[PDB]
Amino acid sequence: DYKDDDDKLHSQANLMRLKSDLFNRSPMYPGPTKDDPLTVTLGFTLQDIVKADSSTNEVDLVYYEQQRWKLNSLMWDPNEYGNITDFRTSAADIWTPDITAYSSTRPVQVLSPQIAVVTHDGSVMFIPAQRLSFMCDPTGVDSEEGATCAVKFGSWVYSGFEIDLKTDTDQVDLSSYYASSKYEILSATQTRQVQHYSCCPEPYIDVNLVVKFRER
Amino acid sequence: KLHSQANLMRLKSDLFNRSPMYPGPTKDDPLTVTLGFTLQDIVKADSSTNEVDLVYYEQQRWKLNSLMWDPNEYGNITDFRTSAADIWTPDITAYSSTRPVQVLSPQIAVVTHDGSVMFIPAQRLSFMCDPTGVDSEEGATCAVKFGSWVYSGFEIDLKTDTDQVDLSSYYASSKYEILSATQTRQVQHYSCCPEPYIDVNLVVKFRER
Amino acid sequence: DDDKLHSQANLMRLKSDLFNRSPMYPGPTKDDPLTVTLGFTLQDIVKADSSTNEVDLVYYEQQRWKLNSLMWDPNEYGNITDFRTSAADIWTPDITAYSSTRPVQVLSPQIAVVTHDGSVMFIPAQRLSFMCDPTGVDSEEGATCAVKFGSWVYSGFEIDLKTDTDQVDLSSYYASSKYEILSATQTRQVQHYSCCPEPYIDVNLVVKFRERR
Amino acid sequence: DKLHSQANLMRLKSDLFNRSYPGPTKDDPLTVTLGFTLQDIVKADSSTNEVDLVYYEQQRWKLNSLMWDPNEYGNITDFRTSAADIWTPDITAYSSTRPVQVLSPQIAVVTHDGSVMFIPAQRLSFMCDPTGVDSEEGATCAVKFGSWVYSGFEIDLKTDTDQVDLSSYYASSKYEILSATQTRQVQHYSCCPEPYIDVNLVVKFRER
Amino acid sequence: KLHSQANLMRLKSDLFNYPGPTKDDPLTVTLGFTLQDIVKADSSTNEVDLVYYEQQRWKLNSLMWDPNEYGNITDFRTSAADIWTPDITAYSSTRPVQVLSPQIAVVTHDGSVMFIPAQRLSFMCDPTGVDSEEGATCAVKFGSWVYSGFEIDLKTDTDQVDLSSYYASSKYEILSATQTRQVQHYSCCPEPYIDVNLVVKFRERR
Ligand SMILES: *[C@@H]1O[C@H](CO)[C@@H](O[C@@H]2O[C@H](CO)[C@@H](O[C@@H]3O[C@H](CO)[C@@H](O)[C@H](O[C@H]4O[C@H](CO)[C@@H](O)[C@H](O)[C@@H]4O)[C@@H]3O)[C@H](O)[C@H]2NC(C)=O)[C@H](O)[C@H]1NC(C)=O
Ligand SMILES: CC1=NCCC[C@]12CCCCC21OCCO1
Ligand SMILES: CC1=NCCC[C@]12CCCCC21OCCO1
Ligand SMILES: CC1=NCCC[C@]12CCCCC21OCCO1
Ligand SMILES: CC1=NCCC[C@]12CCCCC21OCCO1
Ligand SMILES: CC1=NCCC[C@]12CCCCC21OCCO1
Ligand SMILES: *[C@@H]1O[C@H](CO)[C@@H](O)[C@H](O)[C@H]1NC(C)=O
Ligand SMILES: [Cl-]
Ligand SMILES: [Cl-]
Ligand SMILES: [Cl-]
Ligand SMILES: [Cl-]
Ligand SMILES: [Cl-]
């Protein structure tokens, strides 16, 4: 009826007003600082090992990387905006962490839309699907124990004073792993690491993705 | 002609400036997107990586109240063509691609006076597919799901007009002949999330010509 | 040299009155349809892949159309009869290969020539991969392949196509190509498709070629 | 002084770019000088008759709209600026088989007399039959460079020499250069009543 | 926490509203290479592919600020598009550089900037002898494309390439890697030209 039509128009005007009040009325987040540090939660869902190149020692993964963080500057009261509890927005509208593979051999290829979900408590969920080429000797992939390769993910420019990383579990999600991949996964772990490098006194944080796989 | 041109420029200005823009679907304002595939070619089947490359055009249809107009107010313009950047479009994504989709057609949609939008992107898609059996009579079978990347069934529903893939543009001298191609709406509940997720499952059975 | 400053001022004034002081052309309509003339100049068959049935062409595609909204009196603009402009400053037709297997690679600058009668000429050079079975390319008869070109989104009621000639221009064809051209035609076609109710117009590029020996 | 030098350059660029060019015309034609420095023949593909060159292409022209009095801007005689800030000529290979790959920053040098020097490094794949490359006499291939959209009436081309600069050619290339010339040509095509100008790059090379 | 954000936002605003170096306002760029991998060596085309991160440091008076005026903020991370960056270019690449890291730099209160682009580079290299004891040697020069030694000086902190992150299971082992400032007076141009010459000696793992 007209009431239902009015409620939909109101829901749209409420969303437009909330996104306006966060992005127009408030200047985009400048990123974390030693005084305002930020924990990014990382999680990997490994979908496929596409290729293992023994001629270059490069391996190609397809996965989706779940990133979660929380900003005060993104909080709102659902009761002020028609009980809007969350919204979808272009990743370009918000700050996103510079989470980078430390040993890629090619630019990451993005396989999913650059859109995130923002929740009223100011939490952000961003799940980019990627194809990655990284440094990996596949020697042993034709063996019972298979090959093992590792790649570290972390901020490229922020130390542990500004950006901390967390995992919810050290088990890579394999529940979406392609059943007819050329490679079967023997194990996949994601482990937070704290490193002190010689360059700099600040500790650095990464999540180490370790994959054990063999030819099916 | 100059009147017709003025009427279309007025219509586009009314819809894109003078009306507030649509912010995407919500739980309170859900959207149904109709998907259909027209399969043009299986270009390549890589048994070294279990990747298959398809070329198709994907018809996407949806309807917004904010894109409606009365043709009698605009010299009986009943539709127009517009850049996809001008309007909201659904984030329809292959779930098991191995490479970024390559777009083969212009980013232009058709808007009709009832507020319905038709967008027909042609794509080259690399996806996870074991072609084992392609050189046999039974051929190989591969599947890829398509759906919203970021919207659940509470904001975007999917439908097909038919579960038969359109094979009317399938390349007659392809390396691969199609034994069957179906497109089937599926509802799934993942462990992560309590709300339902919707996809369309493209299932292709094919063999060497 | 003073005149040169006036000539530049005139062209800048012309461009400004055409682009800055008007809303960009919204494209053709059923009431105001547009005829685009196409011609292909085939430069090279670079590659014929028998493993995927894809062939790679290099050509430049001449596009010509005419808009009243681009007309000017040369007398009001220091007798300027035409100008070069970025393809981003003007509407251009969405002429698309029907059966490409990869995005077209653009080999020439995105610049067109606008003439005082409102006529535009745009000549994009392209490398195109398209669906083609090269079986018989190593035979006397050679191989035959075809690819249609037309608006992706506009039917025959909004965009009509014509050619000046049904013969592809082979005058620039690379003499030391791996493939020699037996024939190349470009032919207007009016067709109805399963996707859409109204007729669409294309130019069918048909190429018969064989290994150079 | 240094603070004043920055202020002067910023004001000059502001005056040249923000205060004040639509490209050349019949009434205001432009001469572009081209020179090639051939760095490497990377690859010769006898399956497709494509050859890949790496070179830098020196482009020079002079605009009245870019000249200034150095005395009026702290004796600044030249400056570097992004190529996007200025008009640049649409010099195009006539017979490329792939889009040119740009290897150098899109930055030009502008001088107080309004002269501009832009030196893009490029990897180019072009139409070339390398038959004979494995012989003493080697292979010969040629590629024309010129404006895509401007006839000889708007853009004239010049070379300083017909000799391609080989002083930077890669000494351990798979291919040695026997000769490399760059020749201005005036061409009439059946399409067009205006003459068109190109520089014909001709390279004779063999397997080392 | 809200005060720290406010202060950082204010600083960025004040700083961001540089035309590059000049003879009168010259710049020094410090370069250091951290070689991660020789991915492949192509003897059919004499191209080699390196993966490394290139540390770039320079200092501008215009980027200096007093920390006490901005709540003890000693530095900030910013998009490379917000600031001037030097046009450091490989002189003998055969393909455009592929950028493997985010275009973000660190700006410090003294006006210093550190930018560390990770890159994959294809460059001119004959790998002949890579399968011998002596290995193969290749070199590539890095410098400003458009600025002379009058506007941009280049230097290295050390002539030893950092090999401490070199991939242990690379197809190629490094026998030595050096990064050496060179001054060259070309014929065309009376002013000195500065590059850093990256020289890598490598051989197949046995
Ligand atoms: C846009 O579309 C609208 C709606 O289709 C259209 O309005 C319609 O115009 C037609 C023609 O003027 C109208 O048709 C008339 O209907 C009346 C009954 O109401 C008839 O009696 C008329 O018949 C006489 O006139 C005919 C010629 O006009 C003769 O051939 C005939 O023998 C009779 O003498 C006639 O059929 C119609 O009523 C309207 N409809 C509405 C809803 O108003 C409009 O013209 C179109 N164009 C534009 C720019 O808007
Ligand atoms: C995160 C990062 N950023 C820039 C340089 C490279 C790297 C990553 C590889 C190890 C060193 C490093 O530096 C500091 C800590 O980690
Ligand atoms: C559509 C989507 N978006 C983000 C995570 C991955 C994925 C797609 C693969 C299966 C799970 C999934 O999650 C919820 C619905 O489907
Ligand atoms: C040009 C075009 N536009 C949109 C869908 C696909 C296509 C091209 C392939 C055949 C059908 C078609 O539809 C109508 C005309 O031709
Ligand atoms: C320079 C140029 N521009 C547009 C198409 C191709 C070409 C060059 C090959 C011959 C025809 C041509 O067209 C006009 C005159 O020259
Ligand atoms: C840095 C540079 N810029 C433009 C042309 C090429 C190059 C680099 C290769 C050697 C010569 C050179 O020219 C002058 C000094 O250095
Ligand atoms: C253009 O040419 C015509 C005829 O040759 C002449 O009358 C006129 O003065 C010229 N200039 C202008 C500004 O119209
Ligand atoms: Cl944000
Ligand atoms: Cl919309
Ligand atoms: Cl236009
Ligand atoms: Cl200019
Ligand atoms: Cl700066």
User: Can you spell out the DSSP letters for B118-173?
Assistant: EE--EEEEEEE---TTTTSSS-EEEEEEEEESS--TTTEEEE-S-SB-B-TT--TT
Cα–Cα separations (whole angstroms), residue E164 to A149, E37, E60: 19, 11, 30
Domain A2-216 fold? Acetylcholine Binding Protein; Chain: A, (2.70.170)
Task: Say if the Cβ atoms of A8 and B24 lie within 8 Å.
Answer: no
Q: Where are the alpha helices (DSSP H) in chain B?
A: 2-13
Residue D181, token pair as written in the block: 């010339």
DSSP-based three-state secondary structure for C193: strand
Q: Tell me whether residue C51 is annotated as binding.
A: no
Residue D195 token pair: 């003459």
In 10 A of CB D45, how many CB atoms?
Answer: 16
Could you tell me the two tokens for C149? Answer: 């070109």
Find out if CATH 2.70.170.10 is the number for domain B1-209.
yes
Which residue, D74, A5, A196, is CA-closest to E25? D74
Q: Which residues line ligand 4 (CB under 6 A)?
A: B 57, 120, 169; C 98, 150, 152, 193, 195-196, 200
Q: What value does the CA radius of gyration of chain B take, rounded to a whole number of Å? A: 20
Rounded Cα–Cα distance for residues C171 and D187 (Å): 14
Closest CA to E91 of E124, E62, E69: E124
Question: Rounded CA gap, C112 and D177, in Å?
Answer: 38
Tokens linked to B188: 């799934």
* Separation between Cα atoms, residue E54 and residue E31, nearest integer Å: 7
For residues E71 and E78, the answer to whether their CB atoms sit within 8 Å is no
Interatomic CA distance for residues E1 and A196, integer angstroms: 26
Which of E47, E62, E146 has the CB atom closest to D105's CB atom?
Answer: E146
Count how many residues are written for chain B: 209
Task: Tell me the CA–centroid distance for residue D103 and ligand 11, in Å.
Answer: 23
- Report CA-CA distances (Å) from D123 to A124, D94, D103, D140, E88: 43, 15, 7, 19, 18
Write out the two tokens for E24: 């009168």
b/e burial code for range A8-32 (CB count within 10 A of at least 16 → b): eeebbebbebbbeebeeeeeebbbb
Contact A8 B22 (CB under 8 A): no
Burial class (CB in 10 A: 0-12, 13-18, 19+), C61: buried
- Token output for E48: 């080699």
Are E8 and A30 in contact (CB < 8 Å)? yes
Q: Are D39 and D177 in contact (CB under 8 A)?
A: no
- Alpha-carbon span B31 to B155, nearest angstrom: 6
Indicate contact of D with C: 3+ CB pairs under 8 A.
Answer: yes
Mutate to test the pocket of ligand 6, among E123, E140, E145 (most ligand atoms within 8 A of CB): E145
Distance in angstroms (rounded) separating the CA atoms of residues E21 and E147? 8
Where along chain C do its domains lie? 1-213
Nearest to C147 by CA among C211, C100, C192: C100
In short, whether C78's Cβ falls inside 6 Å of ligand 7 is yes
- The Cα B38–Cα B56 span in angstroms is 5
CB A80 within 8 A of CB A21: no
Amino acid at D95: S
Nearest-angstrom CA–CA distance, D204 and D169: 14
Query: Residue E166 has what DSSP assignment?
Result: -
Q: How far is CA D177 from CA D170, E139, E178, in A?
A: 10, 21, 30
- How close are the terminal C-alpha atoms of chain C, in Å? 58
Resolution (A): 2.0
Q: Which of A156, A164, A165, A205 to mutate to test the pocket of ligand 2 (most atoms within 8 A of CB)?
A: A156
CA distance C176 to C29: 45
Superfamily of domain D1-208: Neurotransmitter-gated ion-channel ligand-binding domain (2.70.170.10)
Identify which of C101, C80, C108, C91 has the alpha carbon closest to the alpha carbon of residue C36.
Answer: C91
Q: Which of D158, D142, D121 is nearest to D205 (CA)?
A: D142
The alpha carbon of D112 and the centre of ligand 9 are apart by a number of angstroms equal to 50
DSSP string, A96-122: ---EEETTBSS--EE-S-SEEEEETTS
Residue B58 is which amino acid? E
Chain B closest-CA separation from residue C92 CA (Å): 12
Q: Which amino acid is at A42?
A: L
Q: Do D150 and C84 touch (CB under 8 A)?
A: yes
For residue E3, the surrounding DSSP H or E stretch is helix E2-16
- Report whether residue A194 contacts ligand 2, using a CB cutoff of 6 Å: no
E196 neighbors E140 (Cβ within 8 angstroms): no
> Of B65, B57, B102, B109, nearest to B83 (Cα)?
B109
- Strand C196-211 to strand C179-193: parallel, antiparallel, or no bridges (unpaired)? antiparallel
Residues 6+ apart with CB under 8 A from C147: C97, C98, C99, C100, C128, C130, C131, C132, C204, C205
Question: Chain E: which residues have CB within 8 Å of chain A?
Answer: 1-2, 4-5, 8-9, 12, 36-37, 39-40, 51, 71, 73, 76-77, 98-102, 104-106, 116, 118, 120, 164, 167, 169-171
Estimate to the nearest angstrom the gap between the alpha carbon of A59 and the chain centroid: 20
Residue D117 CB less than 6 A away from ligand 6: no
How many angstroms separate the CA atoms of B17 and D6, rounded?
A: 42
Pairwise CA distance, residues D160 & D149, whole Å: 23
E147, E194 Cβ separation under 8 angstroms: no
Smallest CA separation from ligand 3 atom 1, residue: B149
Q: Do A116 and B49 touch (CB under 8 A)?
A: no
Give CA E75 to chain center in angstroms: 21
CB under 8 Å to A36, separation ≥6 — which residues? E1, E4, E5
From the candidate CATH numbers 1.10.240.10, 1.10.10.10, 2.40.128.280, 2.70.170.10, the one assigned to the domain spanning E1-206: 2.70.170.10
Cα–Cα dist C106/C124, whole Å:
7
Residue whose Cα lies nearest atom 8 of ligand 4: it is: C98
CATH topology of domain C1-213: Acetylcholine Binding Protein; Chain: A, (2.70.170)
3-class secondary structure, E62? strand
Q: Determine contact, residues D182/D157, Cβ cutoff 8 Å.
A: no
Q: A19 CA distance to ligand 8 centroid (A)?
A: 11
Per-residue tokens: A161? 């004073």
CA distances from residue D44 to C51, C127, D207, E137 in whole angstroms, order as listed: 22, 19, 10, 24
Tell me the two tokens of residue A136: 């990996």
Largest Cα separation within chain D, whole Å, is 62
Do the beta carbons of residue D34 and residue D182 sit within 8 Å? yes
Instruction: Find where tokens 């939909």 sit.
Output: A8
C-beta A204 within 6 A of ligand 2: yes
Question: What pairing do the DSSP bridges indicate for beta strands E47-64 and E27-42?
Answer: antiparallel
Q: Which residues on C lie below 8 Å from B1 (Cβ)? A: 31-32, 68
- The C-alpha atoms of residue D106 and residue D81 are separated, in whole angstroms, by 9
Residues in chain E: 206
